[PDB]
Design a protein around this ligand. Structure first.
Ligand code: SAH
Ligand code: SAH
Ligand code: EDT
Ligand code: MG
Ligand code: MG
Ligand code: MG
Ligand code: MG
Lengths: 397, 397
């Protein structure tokens, strides 16, 4: 049925220790063997306190050694231990599948040979970028590329959307050196940005803080300023560029008609923007945070009561404790998945409904047991024909 | 100098409890007041065990009430408490700035009025998508849009890169209903996908697991199949689409020359792919994981030793403990930032070098204190002219 051995690949996030997820920590602690690739030493020291059997993958880089040969070796070290029947965890900084080769290789090999294989997501450098630069990828869309790939494959830009470029400090480099990369082809990237955006358009040099007390680098330059030797020298191995839009894109009349966004009149202007505006975009006008409509909405707070169809939390200590244990104890989760009914029978202090919900394991049953559903909602809701009960959208266009 | 009151906005991730970051948890526990917007009840119950003063923001939605008026109210509830001098935490599921309006509004208002304001990144639905579908945004680039915005602004697609569309279950809808959205304009999205990709191109319906024991939905359909009523009905409020590339893009000869990727010969073919290949892409041929070059690299593992310029961890329990405390205790971090020297003096058992590094607070000093730097590296490295010491790149194109 199920052969011995598994591979779980997890992330640490970017900022030391704090940006690791609770589940990444729990799998590191439970593992028989840990392999890791991180930048900062505080995160390294933290990992070594959590498991007695760790190996640093960074020792498999070398001067003039092809990165592809290093990545083949990193992946094989992990899969060898999986073949021996061990529960193996690989750890990469940030998100372990965002701009990472050996994680995807090791997982695909493990899966093809019939072992359990999973990647757990983490916080990427792009996630940090959205938080520190105060932008949302939804407004007005986001394009993300590797800088060398961007140039070699002539990947398209959209002047109306966000652009994010990773690896701007090693344009055209296939190998490794411990002292760092000589970024002498950086001018080729700058020529492309001049062609697409113009010499006076802004580019933001972004470096997320790796230690908890440090501030991020968020330095705006013109495309032309990147040609200056003193500025170009600041771009290194953990540098990312953000290039904001040049203009606002107009609406399509045919789509406005078919989606019925009309009172036989007209919608707002393409530059009638929702507060707040993108502060990096050139010549962006100031947007009013408290318009008359905003003021009227705030005035309604005084007499507000929860709507009749709102579903209040109504659970117990015993149920909350078991759901927390399933999220934070990998051994308990494996036991539950192997036999829902046996596991559910063994949990003390659960109510009859709570016990029945765990026996089934269905999402809607568990939700039903933990939230009170009013009669007004169920009379209008249409339950059978959950799939159609989680509706929490927090943005509008 | 510094007025009373602060706003910190944090995320919970997508999968219940486990995908919260260690720092998000620590700020929730330290807060004077917590405001939250989450989908699953186990995460809600968990938050309420961590702070005694919480408010559910979901109660400010209502039937036929504009989402913009709800978002104005959500933001004002948070900022009102900041103005009173309290340390306030707002909590949104996933990443709190990815497809979220009220977080960016509240933070911008707080910052403009002179209060401390910060967003901490979290794990988004797109982060989960990369992990569960086994793709990397770097290969071959990624475009991300809101589905209604995609249609109304006629946003461009690239047939050679990844495409991700959020909010495919509420095409054209500006308001709210507790029983869910009537997605009767879904056919308009399908027409656009047919125009761009063709009727037989794959589309993956993705729903990340929200509870720890459930599997994700990863269902492939043709564009044509989305017109069938039984399939269209499965798309809801937590549905995202992934559309894989149609073809491989060729290399630019001028860039190959200027980056010097030539031995007076030729590079690999545009479909000479690195293992593993994208399994969702149509008519993708099978790629060999163990080529002769892979086999030779693995053979070198037997006689491997760490290179002479490798930097081993060399720290102490006292130093590791303080760096962990700064990441996990917001009060300790604030104390350290207010007076580096006073804080550093008060930590017992630190060595002279460790103590001096904390007094300074500079990244390179702390790194120097925790890692042994060999003489071979420093003779070639060029320290002064760290910025140019973190070089850990884990992918090649
Ligand atoms: N502290 C930091 N700030 C900004 N970008 C960073 C960074 N650390 C790494 N990067 C980006 O990531 C590239 C290395 S690739 C590894 C990325 C990592 N898995 C992640 O999830 O983000 C760098 O060249 C840079 O573009
Ligand atoms: N469990 C899930 N699986 C896939 N997509 C999801 C999801 N939950 C939310 N989404 C996506 O997010 C949209 C709501 S917008 C909020 C997104 C959230 N802040 C995040 O970081 O991901 C949904 O319409 C859907 O496109
Ligand atoms: O050639 C294409 O197909 C790509 N663009 C063509 C126009 N490109 C060129 C560019 O990036 O400048 C975008 C544009 O400028 O309109 C249209 C499309 O999305 O299919
Ligand atoms: Mg993690
Ligand atoms: Mg253009
Ligand atoms: Mg979080
Ligand atoms: Mg096209």
């Amino acid at each position: 049925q199920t052969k011995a051995g598994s591979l779980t690949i997890v992330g640490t996030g970017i900022e030391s220790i704090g940006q690791m997820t609770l589940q990444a920590l729990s799998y590191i602690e439970a593992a028989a063997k840990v392999f890791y690739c991180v930048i900062d030493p505080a995160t390294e020291a933290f990992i070594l306190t959590k498991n007695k059997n760790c190996v640093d993958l960074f020792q498999y880089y070398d001067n003039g050694k092809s990165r592809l040969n290093t990545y083949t070796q990193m992946s094989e070290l992990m899969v060898r231990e999986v073949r021996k029947g061990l529960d193996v965890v690989g750890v990469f900084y940030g998100h372990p599948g965002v701009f990472v080769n050996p994680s995807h290789r090791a997982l695909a090999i493990a899966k093809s040979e019939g072992y359990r294989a999973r990647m757990l997501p983490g916080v990427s450098a792009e996630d940090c970028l959205f938080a520190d630069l105060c932008i949302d990828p939804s407004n007005p869309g986001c394009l993300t590329y590797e800088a060398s790939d961007f140039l070699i494959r002539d990947r398209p830009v959209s002047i109306h959307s966000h652009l994010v470029l990773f690896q701007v400090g090693c344009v055209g480099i296939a190998d490794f050196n411990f002292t760092g990369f000589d970024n002498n082809k950086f001018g080729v990237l700058v020529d492309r940005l001049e062609q697409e955006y113009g010499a006076e358009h802004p580019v933001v040099h972004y470096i997320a803080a790796m230690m908890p007390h440090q501030d991020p680098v968020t330095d705006k330059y013109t495309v032309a300023q990147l040609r200056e030797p003193e500025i170009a020298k600041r771009v290194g191995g953990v540098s990312t560029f953000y290039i904001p839009p040049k203009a606002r894109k107009a609406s399509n009349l045919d789509i406005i008609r078919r989606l019925e966004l009309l009172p036989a009149g007209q919608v707002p202007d393409k530059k009638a923007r929702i507060y707040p505006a993108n502060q990096w975009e050139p010549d962006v006008p100031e947007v009013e945070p408290y318009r008359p409509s905003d003021q009227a909405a705030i005035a309604q707070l005084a007499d507000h009561a929860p709507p009749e169809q709102y579903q209040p939390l109504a659970t117990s200590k015993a149920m909350s404790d078991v759901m927390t244990k399933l999220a934070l104890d990998p051994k308990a989760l494996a036991d539950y998945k192997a036999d829902h009914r046996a596991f559910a029978q063994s949990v003390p202090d659960l109510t009859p409904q709570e016990r029945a919900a765990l026996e089934l394991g269905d999402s809607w049953a568990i939700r039903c047991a933990m939230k009170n559903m009013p009669s007004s909602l169920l009379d209008a809701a249409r339950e059978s024909g959950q799939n159609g009960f989680p509706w929490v959208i927090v943005v509008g266009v």
